[PDB]
Amino acid sequence: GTLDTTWKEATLPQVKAMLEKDTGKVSGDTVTYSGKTVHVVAAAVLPGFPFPSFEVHDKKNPTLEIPAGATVDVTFINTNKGFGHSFDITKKGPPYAVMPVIDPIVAGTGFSPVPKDGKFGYTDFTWHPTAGTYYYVCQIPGHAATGMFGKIVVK
Ligand SMILES: [Cu+2]
Fold first, then answer.
1. Which cofactors are named for this entry?
2. Considering only CA atoms, which of 96, 106, 26 is closest in space to residue 60?
């Protein structure tokens, strides 16, 4: 309501499914979406992946290139058994603040759920971007500054 609260939970095989069903090509080090369905399948510190960075299927937030004319659909799989990680899209840019300064959020998620065994907290939220550059951050203290952010180049 405040932010996008489209919270759900699947299970492990759906994570595998979603990871396949992603339009994010590997621009060498960076990730680059393509097609009008910019289906951003992302995850946050799943038990095995170390802190503090956000996972983006093939990589861990190098940076995201986006085709401006497309519809963005952020599919989180935040299943960090501790922190209700958020995905909050705005500007700010690096360095991100240690204190979670909630600068005017465009699209964002007000802290997605914290599952138990087997189940996988996901959140499908939609966004229509504008050309140039934005950044997304997890507005939990330290998290953004320490690593879980992503530069969104919309061109
Ligand atoms: Cu976080």
1. Cu cation
2. 26
Q: 3-39 b/e with 16+ CB inside 10 Å = b?
A: bbeebebbeeebbeebeeebbbeeeeebbbbeeeebb
Domain ranges of the chain: 1-155
Distance (Å, rounded) from C-alpha 13 to C-alpha 19?
Answer: 10
Cα of 129 from ligand 1 centre, angstroms: 23
Taking the centre of ligand 1 as the mean of its atom positions, its distance from the CA of residue 96, in whole angstroms, is: 13
CATH of span 1-155: 2.60.40.420
Retrieve residue 55's tokens.
Answer: 């996972």
**Of 57, 68, 74, nearest in space to 34 by CA:** 68
User: Do the annotations mark residue 99 as ligand-binding?
Assistant: no
